[PDB]
Write a protein that binds this ligand. Structure first.
Ligand SMILES: OC[C@H]1O[C@@H](O[C@H]2[C@H](O)[C@@H](O)[C@H](O)O[C@@H]2CO)[C@@H](O)[C@@H](O)[C@@H]1O
Ligand SMILES: OC[C@H]1O[C@@H](O[C@H]2[C@H](O)[C@@H](O)[C@H](O)O[C@@H]2CO)[C@@H](O)[C@@H](O)[C@@H]1O
Ligand SMILES: OC[C@H]1O[C@@H](O[C@H]2[C@H](O)[C@@H](O)[C@H](O)O[C@@H]2CO)[C@@H](O)[C@@H](O)[C@@H]1O
Ligand SMILES: OC[C@H]1O[C@@H](O[C@H]2[C@H](O)[C@@H](O)[C@H](O)O[C@@H]2CO)[C@@H](O)[C@@H](O)[C@@H]1O
Lengths: 389, 389, 389, 389
């Protein structure tokens, strides 16, 4: 029948999309390798999430539930596989979480047939997003995410003012999720991330204090907070680890991405930095390192951005944005960086621990002015010209 | 001569552009079919609107009047033809109206040789835009549009503050237009649209009360107002029909598009919804239905967006926008939806009354939260997996 | 060795990029001719600016200093060559100046091996940008640029508030630059430009008074100020030459681009105009002319924009922007216009003095309303239809 | 496993290829419509014909039996479906027959899982090829094909000398084939085709007498032979119906394609014509019509070719060739023409009975000289110019 042929073609086209081999982009900067195709798009969501496949109830074979974007994904190596914890945004503008897995880390990502069922905390949330996964030494996988609600303080007609809390959930199988109490804290928080080891016998969070839902106000950067009990999590002392600076890529706000990778040289961090421009907010990725002895102590601050939107990345629902809350480092040192572009699609970039540490240690630090930038550059030029002779 | 050859080539290239056959995009969602090419762009404006073709006064053969965009078009079936009432924006940043016609509804749109001459109301307007055409049962074609003027209240140096009124004009041939008094109302209005039938013997308008020129403030959504005399139009009672909601595609504002289509199941509406993001305002299209017995009563509210920017649509003068104020439904049920992308160009999408009603009735309603979205999705997945077994 | 082969390929690929022949775009408006490729991108910066080429210190051969954008360039004809004074933005978000030269004006631009060393004025600047070069009759090449600093008045957490001064430097070889005192003035200034001739025996500046760092506030447009001593430059009297207007392409702000070209008909100006839209600020180019007898007197005001973003130009770090602060007119009348798109890359457009003057004189003036625009257009249509008969 | 993933991808890629929607080529001559994609290529053969899918016996997953070409196909409408009787050539250079079916006639052709098992006649054949299917009024489907054998009457070392005979088989299900005795005839024969009706109570064959295996020699064209008993088929009298002509597209040889279609105007024929050129033999398609009352009598001979190689068709194993031995005419008059290009792939072209008859009746007959061609052309030009005036 025509209907059955149509269903068969939808399914076949979907498999062809899912199975497409990714290829590295030859042109690069020697630090990271980009790939020709996104690892996930809205079109990668299962056909059976979007269409009612029953001819009796959907004779025209149209989508019943539109999928809009696959973005800001957490990531974990899981039982031999490369997993993303995807933020999937429906056409209804709500996001939910969904696991996708790949055998190789760069292609053939496929969603688990059901998305994540995440129980509410005591106060229901309207939207949940941007989960960072941490395999903690306590044996649990934690997902720390943003739980967003309408601001009850808002005046008449204001249906946009919102509040953000840090949601905390844990699991041992990524299917059954236990919802713990939202993080208790004196300001708004987003980009909260669990450090994978106890520090002084306590849970350690990366935080991002902010005075408002979008603007950080007095918030100074990426913070560090020790928590006695993750099941009744409350911030007491909070220390800023990586600061915002005028006229850098992290001027207006910043935030930790995935939890950092442990290297022999220190903790290797991936974060985002924001500035304002005539087109709105511009988000790029950057890196820094902290000490193994004292994870609050910066030991590498390469100048500028690590990655910024290139080509197709520049455009989407929220253009001029890269964002990452997930990466995977294999035992052999290979690193798979999962980053969203423009709040619309997921990409992968690859590198190695050795290359990323090299980048952090030997990209000169920002001297914070045009004159300083020129002096650093002239020094490199001089070395190169002498060599090229 | 070289000049004459140049004119001949301008004219020939223009005809080739105008005559190009459109083709449907194979990949779609089963609800609407997109098309490979826009139905109108600035390049579709006549050569003789832009160039002075006289060698004596334009020896270099350069454009004398630049055309910037063809957007936000009304639409009507007219004497066997498919007509758009185009908003054409010049390089001078003023818009004017112009009729374009096609024999088939998807390609070969051609502007009438002269654009629309629209007389001023008592108070002159600086810009006019976004006309909705209504063939009213009273025998007139009405165009309801936005008439914009500088805000006299503005302080020194403020050359941007503006006010919007609903302009009302009528015609029986789309060439001779009678300008009626601007709509009298207690707030700013844009997206005002005439319902095609009398209701309780009165003219019925879709309205969109707004506290400011761009922000709606207390304005609750798309309104309904009965008007005794369209030639002295004044709003008295006003009822909100379709409301804004936090964390939907119509959070910050919304507005009726073209006048709705009458179906056996009810009035079928096409509207736009706006939210804010890091890149600015994002505009998408959505649908709803109201009762034939009581056109103020919602009877279908499919969740989320009906159409959102895809591909080339995402980029233009005002990126991240779809907007529609025109569609045509033929007697056989075929629907031609005319929508602008990014305030720059006009597109067509096709569907049928049956498919659009199916979409409105069977796309689940928004339960307004991530948890609710997940439950709806899990229900569909469960049905499909049982079927696919 | 593999490393040496990699270096050799980086260098070879760079030469292939630099040497690529540009080609004009056939489709145009008869006023300006666009070109297929940008004249500069970040990839055009020398390999030896970005990479450490020594295997001992960079064994992975990765970039040590990322380059982000090449934009807003000044321009001058210099000893037979076509020169841009490029604003180069590093990955660190600081800009610096750098000379690039071409033998023909449309391709084969190559950076001088060292960028510009620009001494600080008494108060150090954080960023410097957008230099206009003027070969003044006094025998010096002046560069007038923006010097930006953090606003000390800013409250806690505000790392974005900034102040702009007009920096002044001069040179006779484009390598050794003398920094003069920043322009003294009662308001913020950006887009300051030196007129190439003395007027009443005084230096003459194009100015752009603004109440704030981004918003002009009461600032009325492009100004004119006579300065007694360029080495102790201070504005006294200041006159607005070209004004902002509601509902034009220069509504919110405007600014002089390069210094104007002297023609037998008057001074030929290139400027930018800004308006706000749902996507942010939109920047286009426009032209005007002033009198040789009195350079403060407007003698041509063609309506609307001269150039606006087309195609690839629309997208970049700061999308929806064209900006020019450099052009070159050869003795034969050929004009090379150097314009940035989206704060990301540099383009060239070509025309002639005769064509640009024709465009300025015969593009109708803006009558400031939709009705006026329609009347101008109908007049041209009528002439053309009579001719085409 | 990696192996199972590879098999899954082979199968998925194959289904995507098989299900691809064909699209008509817009630009045409108004007689036939070509299509963007071939209906069959060697890649369309089943994955399980080429690969051993068992990891135990094919651990590298390589092809065990290469498929080289899908060409010269018969065709029949069968139980509601569109069927080709494909000549499939293996990498071993032998051809075999195989049924492929489509629901619509222009795409989604899929081979039946097993190819045709064709029993040998008394003398074994080395190759079999180019089957024409005839649903005869006697209730059988006949396949008339070429059976080729080596000719040992050849100099030593001559392994190219061959003899072609007409093989005859019949079936009622296209799976079980009965092999009848090869046609007995005084010359070599290829392109023998069964007429679908008895003529004076006898079977009627289109023949093509030829003195050699490749060259026709004295063979004058397409012949007609009445046969008493198709199960002991022997030609007696043989009349040429359509002749070769110097300096036409059928100079060196010609041959009937599929059996002709019955129309109210006569029998509608599709044939091939051959000439020699510097590159070898050139094959094109042409048409002719014969009388219903007397099928030996020509009643239409449009000049020149009907179709000749265009674009991709020009190149393959045997370039510069079109060949057809199959077409289908639906009850509504729509005609699907299945033609091979360059002995490599199968294409479809569509027309209607009305259009093909119009083409045959109104394309002027060949007057056989340049002067005559010019006079015919000048006559049409004269009519057109007077009309265009
Ligand atoms: O959009 C850029 C980045 O903004 C942050 O989150 C958004 C969130 O995605 C929206 O749904 C909501 O309306 O506003 C938030 C605040 O701007 C950031 O956490 C990222 O999620 C996002 O990529
Ligand atoms: O730009 C998006 C949508 O905004 C609305 O209108 C604009 C109008 O087009 C502008 O010329 C003016 O400056 O501001 C208005 C308010 O934002 C909307 O009605 C649509 O016309 C437009 O697509
Ligand atoms: O971005 C558009 C235009 O804005 C102006 O300058 C920018 C400057 O480039 C930024 O680095 C700074 O942060 O803000 C300035 C004010 O918006 C303008 O002078 C152009 O440089 C620029 O193309
Ligand atoms: O085909 C190559 C070249 O052959 C010569 O002429 C051809 C002629 O074009 C054919 O029509 C005829 O059948 O055979 C001739 C002899 O090969 C040569 O003079 C060129 O015309 C032609 O390009």
């Amino acid at each position: 029948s025509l209907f059955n042929d149509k269903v068969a073609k939808l399914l076949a086209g979907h498999e062809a999309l899912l199975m497409r081999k990714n290829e590295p982009v030859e042109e690069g900067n020697g630090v990271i390798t980009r790939y020709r195709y996104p690892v996930l798009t809205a079109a990668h969501t299962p056909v059976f999430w979007r269409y009612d496949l029953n001819e009796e109830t959907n004779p025209f074979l149209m989508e019943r539930i539109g999928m809009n974007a696959t973005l800001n994904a957490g990531a974990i190596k899981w039982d031999g596989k490369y997993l993303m914890l995807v933020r999937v945004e429906g056409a209804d503008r709500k996001s939910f979480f969904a696991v996708a897995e790949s055998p190789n880390g760069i292609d053939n990502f496929r969603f688990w047939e059901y998305p994540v069922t995440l129980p509410e905390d005591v106060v229901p949330a309207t939207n949940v997003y941007d989960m960072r996964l941490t395999a903690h030494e306590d044996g649990w996988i934690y997902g720390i995410f943003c739980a967003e609600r309408h601001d009850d303080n808002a005046p008449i007609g204001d249906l946009s003012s919102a509040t953000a809390t840090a949601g905390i959930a844990r699991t041992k199988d990524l299917k059954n999720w236990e919802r713990l109490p939202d993080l208790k804290t004196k300001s708004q928080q987003r980009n909260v991330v669990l450090h994978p080891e106890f520090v002084d016998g306590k849970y350690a969070l990366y935080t991002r204090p902010q005075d408002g839902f979008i603007d950080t106000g007095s918030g100074g950067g990426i913070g560090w907070a020790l928590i006695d009990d993750i099941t009744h999590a409350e911030v007491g002392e909070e220390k800023i680890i990586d600061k915002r600076y005028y006229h850098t890529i992290k001027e207006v706000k910043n935030g930790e991405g995935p939890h950092p990778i442990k290297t022999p040289q220190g903790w290797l961090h991936l974060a985002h930095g924001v500035r304002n421009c005539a087109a709105g907010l511009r988000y790029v990725l950057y890196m820094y390192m902290t000490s193994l002895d004292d994870p609050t102590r910066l030991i590498a601050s390469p100048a500028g951005y690590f990655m910024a939107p290139v080509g197709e990345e520049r455009i989407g629902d929220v253009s001029n944005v890269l964002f990452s809350n997930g990466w995977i480092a294999d035992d052999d040192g290979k690193v798979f960086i999962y980053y969203a572009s423009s709040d619309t699609r997921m990409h992968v970039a690859t590198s190695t621990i050795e290359r990323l540490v090299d980048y952090c240690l030997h990209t000169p630090q920002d001297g914070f002015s045009s004159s300083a930038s020129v002096e650093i550059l002239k020094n490199l030029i001089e070395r190169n010209l002498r060599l090229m002779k």
